[PDB]
Design a protein around this ligand. Structure first.
Ligand SMILES: [Mn+2]
Ligand SMILES: [Mn+2]
Length: 542
């Protein structure tokens, strides 16, 4: 944390906090499978390879943040990551140092901040905004924020003291932008523009009602125009605070002229060294409060001459307390502490969420659903990248359940699907996740389907990526009707609702199951064989 001065301006960047108020554990994915053309790129590095790529020594605090390798042991060594208190303390420490050097600091939030946590659900996002205000966030962009609905977002923007930016959120009839595209900040004799981009796929990714009247479409012309306008106004350097997803950002760096640095959210990536694409540097925003990225820039009349990037681990056991934040969280959650923090069950093994294809947490959810609804044959779990990690011997609480399943639309649906639909769903998802054109990458993973097994060839043509599907030990029958369960998506829209079943929040089902069993012990049993790749698993004990 004790860095020497560098450059003219400092960006203190974090993204995809997902309302995570408290220190917790968050392991990186064991697999980030890519079609051959995208292999070895930032955003597709895991395990030992990511450590080698960045020259990070095994067993270090950065290694703990960066890879699943040695996870449990390193979690027991360095402690939990994140927490709004610790993140605040770190941001304040860095901002103070910068200002004492005569430098200039900006606090930039990449979005996916307001939602998906106990604190968020209990306050419809308000407490998270109040926290941003305590820290002093200068700008933010968005994605999951919209799951609170337009009206609530508008209310919260009234409360937010920073300036929300987005070049791409426009009225869906007239096309007039609804927010400022960028803000220019003076940096000594220089000027630095921060341009914002919100996720372009909000409409198809969440309930339609949440964004009625709005368009978020990626618009290269409008983005180029914003960049050009900022420079015409005198901006020497341009930074894009983005929620596009890092691969789409990389594609944009080869298409848009004049973007010097992109701060990439959405994909929850980590980039200890910036990724050079075209004439642009790219730095990812990580997630769940794991890290604060410090980017020091040396500017020149026409852009960024050089930069220093440092991933600062947010390790609560190694940072001072932000007393005002601690007090605020206590006041906000005191009335809900018994609910949020009482143990529901103990997990005997590592429960993780992130992976291209499979996770122990998602398997637990599949087992819970099947235990309560034995008629269900396949359980489709949403492959979101937000969540948390439960260590062996650790108690699972309601706060964890909200971290894993805290959608504002948490309903579990039971419906019938024909066999052909099951296969088609996986193939369609595979076509998106494994497209080789980063311009079309959406930044998501593959739905986890408990109750079935399949073979995946990421490099096969569309229509041939998913094969040898089996349900309950038998080959998939295309004309057979199977009872499916799903939450966090739209799959139920193409099925036949189970008569007599009333959809209810997935977290209620999970709490019922966990209270009943008392202890869980999910062993990693991946249900997918991947052609052309070694499918990796972390060590789940220790
Ligand atoms: Mn996110
Ligand atoms: Mn996102």
């Amino acid at each position: 944390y004790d860095l020497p001065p560098y450059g003219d301006a400092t960006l203190l960047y974090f993204s995809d906090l997902h309302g995570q108020a408290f220190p917790h554990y968050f392991m990186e994915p064991p697999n980030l499978i890519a079609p051959k053309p995208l292999m070895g790129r930032p955003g597709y590095l895991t395990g030992e390879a990511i450590l080698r790529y960045y020259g990070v020594e095994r067993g270090t605090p950065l290694a703990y943040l960066l890879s699943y390798v040695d996870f449990v042991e390193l979690a027991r060594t360095f402690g939990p990551i994140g927490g709004m208190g610790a993140l605040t303390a770190l941001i304040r420490d860095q901002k103070a140092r910068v200002e004492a050097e005569g430098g200039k600091a900006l606090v930039l939030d990449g979005g996916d901040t307001w939602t998906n946590s106990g604190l968020s659900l209990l306050t419809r996002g308000e407490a998270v905004v109040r926290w941003q205000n305590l820290v002093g966030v200068d700008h933010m962009v968005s994605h999951w924020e919209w799951t609170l609905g337009r009206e609530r977002v508008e209310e919260l923007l009234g409360l937010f003291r920073g300036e929300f930016l987005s070049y791409n959120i426009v009225d869906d009839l007239f096309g007039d932008p609804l927010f400022p595209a960028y803000r220019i900040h003076r940096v000594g004799p220089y000027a630095l523009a921060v341009v914002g981009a919100s996720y372009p796929y909000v409409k198809v990714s969440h309930p339609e009602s949440f964004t009625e009247g709005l368009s978020f479409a990626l618009d290269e012309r409008r983005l180029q125009e914003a960049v050009d306008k900022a420079r015409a106004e005198g901006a020497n350097a341009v930074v894009l605070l983005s929620h596009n997803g890092m691969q789409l950002d990389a594609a944009l760096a080869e298409r848009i002229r004049g973007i010097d640095l992109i701060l990439s959210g959405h994909t929850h990536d980590l980039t200890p060294r910036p990724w050079r694409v075209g004439k642009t540097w790219i730095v990812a925003g990580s997630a769940a409060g794991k890290a604060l990225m410090r980017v020091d820039l040396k500017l020149w009349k026409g852009g960024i001459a050089n930069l220093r990037v440092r991933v600062l681990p947010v390790l609560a056991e190694h940072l001072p307390k932000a007393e005002d934040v601690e007090a605020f969280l206590k006041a906000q959650l005191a009335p809900h502490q018994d609910h949020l923090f009482t143990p529901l069950a103990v997990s005997e093994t590592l429960l993780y969420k992130r992976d291209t294809l499979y996770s122990t947490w998602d398997q637990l959810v599949g087992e819970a659903v099947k235990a309560i609804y034995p008629e269900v044959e396949v359980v489709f779990s949403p492959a979101v990248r937000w969540g948390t990690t439960i260590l062996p011997g650790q108690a699972i609480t309601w706060d964890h359940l909200y971290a894993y399943t805290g959608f504002t639309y948490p309903e579990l649906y039971l419906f019938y699907l024909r066999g052909a639909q099951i296969k088609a769903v996986l193939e369609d998802i595979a076509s998106n996740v494994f497209t080789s054109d980063p311009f079309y990458q959406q930044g998501g993973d593959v739905s986890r389907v408990f109750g079935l097994r399949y073979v995946l060839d990421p490099d096969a043509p569309t229509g041939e990526r998913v094969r040898e599907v089996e349900v309950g030990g038998r080959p998939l029958d295309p004309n057979r009707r199977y009872l499916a369960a799903a939450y966090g998506g739209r799959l139920q829209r193409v099925g036949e609702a189970k008569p007599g079943y009333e959809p209810r929040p997935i977290y209620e089902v999970l709490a019922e199951y966990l209270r009943s069993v008392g202890r869980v012990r999910v062993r990693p049993e991946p249900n997918v064989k991947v052609i052309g790749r070694n499918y990796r698993l972390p060590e789940v004990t220790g």
